[PDB]
Design a protein around this ligand. Structure first.
Ligand SMILES: Cn1c(CCC(C)(C)O)nc2cc(C(C)(C)O)c(NC(=O)c3cccc(C(F)(F)F)n3)cc21
Length: 282
């Protein structure tokens, strides 16, 4: 929408105070080749991404997409800055990232099963909208699903997004969430479905996708051993909730497992996911 100057964004972000908001600085998180700061423009609380070449691509990209695609489950951009490193201004997300809330970072209460089931549908409804509008996110992860005052899931980061069985030399995304074909250079909506299946797994277990100090390191692998009756979801169900139902949790593991078929073509499409996630909350 608007075109803020470096200096205003600078002045209302205490000169991009890299100290964390917890200490009473402005730094909220680090993502999309940049650092996200708390701002206060237009008498409203916002989020200001200062961008760390190809950089101008990921900037002007995140504008094009964000200008075409608005939806209840996608973050909204308010404006930007070119005047002296680039900046993007977004609507504040008071409950930050699903990752940070899943790990109860900074002491936030654990998310219920109920809140978890609505966050899953939200995230689906945001991807689907992306997929209906011939868009591939390429970076569906926990850290890219933000949470509002209502704990409504909002997908962020389209500075990697691409419009739509194609191949790319610039392989990019997050290893611990990426599909095999995406890992070898395939650009296919079917990759976004797999990543999402990792997110379903994080929602169910509360485990990060990678933990270098866990056996095994990768959540993907916990799902494989379960598919091989070497483990149970039941054993991994996050203990930090009191409302979880076995039927309901098993219904969501079901969607995940299908999302994580290593055969791109055996993966459900976003609508099947949307539908499956609905039928579970019935
Ligand atoms: C209020 N807040 C708390 C503190 C959490 C509480 C207050 C619950 O402890 N951590 C937060 C973490 C985030 C991150 C940056 C990791 O996403 C954000 N984000 C945003 O506000 C935001 C909004 C739109 C778009 C974007 C962007 F990601 F840049 F695309 N970010 C707010 C947060």
């Amino acid at each position: 929408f608007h075109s803020f100057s470096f200096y205003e964004l600078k002045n209302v972000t205490n000169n991009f105070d890299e100290r964390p908001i917890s200490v009473g600085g402005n730094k909220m998180g680090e993502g999309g080749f940049g650092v996200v700061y708390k701002g206060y423009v237009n008498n409203t609380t916002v989020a200001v991404k200062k961008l760390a070449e190809e950089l101008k691509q990921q900037f002007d990209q995140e504008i094009k997409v964000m200008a075409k695609c608005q939806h209840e489950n996608l973050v909204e951009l308010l404006g930007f800055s070119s005047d002296g490193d680039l900046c993007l201004v977004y609507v504040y997300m008071p409950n930050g990232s699903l990752l940070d809330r899943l790990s109860c970072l900074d002491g936030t209460p654990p998310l219920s099963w109920h809140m978890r089931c609505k966050i899953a549908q939200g995230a689906a409804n945001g991807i689907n909208f992306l997929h209906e509008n011939h868009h591939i996110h390429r970076d569906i992860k926990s850290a890219n699903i933000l949470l509002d005052e209502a704990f409504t899931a909002k997908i962020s980061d389209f500075g990697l997004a691409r419009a739509s069985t194609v191949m790319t030399s610039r392989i990019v995304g997050t290893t611990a969430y990426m599909a095999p074909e995406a890992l070898r250079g395939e650009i296919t909506p079917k990759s976004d479905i797999y990543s999402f299946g990792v997110v379903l797994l994080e929602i169910i277990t509360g485990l990060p996708a990678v933990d270098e100090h866990r056996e095994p390191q990768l959540l993907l692998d916990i799902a494989a051993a379960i598919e091989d009756e070497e483990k149970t979801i039941e054993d991994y169900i996050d203990k930090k909730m009191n409302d979880a139902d076995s039927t309901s949790v098993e219904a969501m593991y079901s969607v995940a497992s299908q999302c994580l078929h290593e055969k791109k073509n055996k993966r459900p499409d976003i609508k099947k996911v949307q539908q499956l996630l609905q039928e579970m909350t019935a």
